Design an enzyme around this catalytic site. Sequence first.
Site, PDB file in Angstrom:
ATOM      1  N   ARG A 186       0.843  -1.190   0.000  1.00 46.58           N
ATOM      2  CA  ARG A 186       0.000   0.000   0.000  1.00 46.58           C
ATOM      3  C   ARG A 186       0.879   1.241   0.000  1.00 46.58           C
ATOM      4  NH1 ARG A 186      -4.347   2.279   3.706  1.00 46.58           N
ATOM      5  NH2 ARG A 186      -5.579   3.520   2.230  1.00 46.58           N
ATOM      6  N   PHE A 194       1.047  10.246   2.636  1.00 47.50           N
ATOM      7  CA  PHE A 194       0.499   9.631   3.832  1.00 47.50           C
ATOM      8  C   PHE A 194       1.485   8.600   4.359  1.00 47.50           C
ATOM      9  CE2 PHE A 194      -1.663   7.544   6.931  1.00 47.50           C
ATOM     10  CZ  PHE A 194      -2.803   6.822   6.662  1.00 47.50           C
ATOM     11  N   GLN A 209       3.078   1.170   3.272  1.00 49.08           N
ATOM     12  CA  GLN A 209       2.625   0.130   4.186  1.00 49.08           C
ATOM     13  C   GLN A 209       2.845  -1.256   3.585  1.00 49.08           C
ATOM     14  OE1 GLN A 209      -1.509   0.540   5.801  1.00 49.08           O
ATOM     15  NE2 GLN A 209      -1.702  -1.628   5.273  1.00 49.08           N
ATOM     16  N   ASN A 245      -2.159  -2.269  12.515  1.00 48.38           N
ATOM     17  CA  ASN A 245      -3.014  -3.190  13.244  1.00 48.38           C
ATOM     18  C   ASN A 245      -4.457  -2.902  12.862  1.00 48.38           C
ATOM     19  OD1 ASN A 245      -2.498  -0.689  14.571  1.00 48.38           O
ATOM     20  ND2 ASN A 245      -3.503  -1.445  16.436  1.00 48.38           N
ATOM     21  N   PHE A 299       4.075   0.146   8.725  1.00 46.77           N
ATOM     22  CA  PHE A 299       4.145   1.190   7.717  1.00 46.77           C
ATOM     23  C   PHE A 299       4.986   2.365   8.185  1.00 46.77           C
ATOM     24  CE2 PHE A 299       1.522   4.388   9.621  1.00 46.77           C
ATOM     25  CZ  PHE A 299       0.449   3.778  10.229  1.00 46.77           C
ATOM     26  N   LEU A 341      -2.546   9.276  13.505  1.00 43.85           N
ATOM     27  CA  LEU A 341      -2.181   7.900  13.798  1.00 43.85           C
ATOM     28  C   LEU A 341      -1.672   7.723  15.222  1.00 43.85           C
ATOM     29  CD1 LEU A 341      -0.077   7.301  10.561  1.00 43.85           C
ATOM     30  CD2 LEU A 341      -2.493   6.747  10.806  1.00 43.85           C
ATOM     31  N   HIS A 364      -1.369   3.831  16.173  1.00 43.56           N
ATOM     32  CA  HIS A 364      -0.424   2.995  15.445  1.00 43.56           C
ATOM     33  C   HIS A 364       0.924   2.939  16.152  1.00 43.56           C
ATOM     34  CE1 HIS A 364      -2.563   1.276  12.261  1.00 43.56           C
ATOM     35  NE2 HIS A 364      -2.861   2.400  11.634  1.00 43.56           N
TER      36      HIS A 364
END
Lengths: 163, 221, 320
Positions: B91, B96, B99, B138, B149, B158, B162
């Site tokens: 990804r 951003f 990932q 997760n 990521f 995040l 994260h």
Amino acid sequence: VTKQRVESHFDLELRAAVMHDILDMMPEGIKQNKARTILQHLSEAWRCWKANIPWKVPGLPTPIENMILRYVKAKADWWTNTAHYNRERIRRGATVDKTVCKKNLGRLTRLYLKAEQERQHNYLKDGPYITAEEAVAVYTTTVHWLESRRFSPIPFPPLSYKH
Amino acid sequence: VDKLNAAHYSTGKVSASFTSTAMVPETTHEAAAIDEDVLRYQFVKKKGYVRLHTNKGDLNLELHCDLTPKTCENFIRLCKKHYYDGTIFHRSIRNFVIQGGDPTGTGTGGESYWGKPFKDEFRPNLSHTGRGILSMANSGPNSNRSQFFITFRSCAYLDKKHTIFGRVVGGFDVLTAMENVESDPKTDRPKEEIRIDATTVFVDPYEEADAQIAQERKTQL
Amino acid sequence: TMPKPQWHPPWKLYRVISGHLGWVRCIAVEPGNQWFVTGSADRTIKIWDLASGKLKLSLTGHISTVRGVIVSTRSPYLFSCGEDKQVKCWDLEYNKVIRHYHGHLSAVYGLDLHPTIDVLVTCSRDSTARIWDVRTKASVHTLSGHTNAVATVRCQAAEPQIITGSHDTTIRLWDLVAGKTRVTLTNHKKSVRAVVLHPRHYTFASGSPDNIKQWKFPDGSFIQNLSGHNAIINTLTVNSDGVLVSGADNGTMHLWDWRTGYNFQRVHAAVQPGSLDSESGIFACAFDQSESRLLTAEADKTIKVYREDDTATEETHPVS
């Protein structure tokens, strides 16, 4: 102090002695170690000693637990010894009462049931005490007698039974 | 229970055997056996340094294996399993994140080293700000997996979501090439496969942990 | 940092008594080393022969714990005090209560008879102390001011005559006659339960969880901070040759020399058969009159008796 307030009194003195001793030594929870909560755990340890249920709350700082066990052992022993003494009074006839009769009955049973739970578990852990020789002797000797008495063994009670 | 294994409280068998009669009396307090990997993490106070070898280049990985010990160690054990070889950065979202972390390369699977989806570790200091934040992908709270990521910039939304385990410290142009890749605006998937090709774990702080732990075991023995 | 500390031979356990049915809270020795008195939480009061270690007598005074006793050297009197809010006096020829000094509001904690003025001084968890006429049941002063339970008192002829240490962590020295506070010391952090007065050095020490401290009379001059026996301390007893004894709460008994404050022995005692280790503890101590043997009343219904170690030399036991 008079026989009425003996219990409430001694209790007060015990709870306060606990407070002084530990909650001046154990802190470094300096603010307040939630003493009130440590005393709730005191009461619960007692309750469980009275009901013969292993009270084992794991996260307790071992020295705090050491204190609590010292104190519950004190109190329960006091309980017992006063039970011994009241029952001796009541058997000696010395006095009457409608409470110190029901109270002592309750205490004395709880002591008994604790002794019993003990004695059963001990039997299981220590095996039948009637070894095997004695068992076989008893059994065989009974059979000798019955047969020598031509005793017809009773049969399971028929349904359409006369009587 | 050796001296290191001496926990903070008793096993409670004295307490039980005292307030009950069905149990055999024992009259010596015995403190518990504290733990394991958790004990280990009291030894892992050092960071982890991994060179990821990807088809774009190498990524130098710094990890606060002191601060996110379970996260970092799951990652490091998948690292010395080389569990990331062939895995793809499935990804990419421009400005951003990038990932990845899937042997499936699908992004919806993966393992923890113990197989068990492990607990999320966000701390007051670890915030996904700047470039090089290395945070756990997760599926929600304490669901941690093989998926991870890097943020391309400050992504504070995040934070508390994260688990960062560290930062990128080398391979800036590698990740620059990565952020220049086209990704499918409906699956955000890199049109060029970017893949973890190899792992080189320079410094294994859990190695040094286990070393000191076992030395103390030998010495107290 | 000190002259080389003297050498006192160690102490060994030799004789153990088990007769009580509760904690042994207090213990005193008779003037002539023939017998010692014990007061327990079993509510008994038990007199024992000091030589044969045999129970000479028992007497059922109180209603609850006997928290402290004291025998008279100027009379065949024996004064008891307990958490039943009451204090009693026994004649020991006819073995009977003869007068009871009412007056406190809560558990007495300890008391002492003044060596020459025939008065008692008793401290109580009611935040006070009192001075009692021996005979006439007269209290001349409510020595007051401690913000909590006056955990102990000791009295002596010289000025000041009354030292009381408390759970307020303070220590207070009082003029007996005006019955007024003279001096305070407030060095301690955690409550202070044990105070002891040297026999020939006009000094005295106080114990608390932190550590012992030492003071010089009549003023309260701090002297020499004694540390090492880091446990709730319950009684200090000092001997002729400067041997000083701190009985801790959790069984760990520690010895030092009074001069240098040199902790030279740790004894860590073994409990009775049936008592869980968590019930270990020391609650009071006393050297005999001839100061050869030592009595300690522990928190597991037992009375342990230690003796000077005879096989001790400077090489058997060096000083460091």
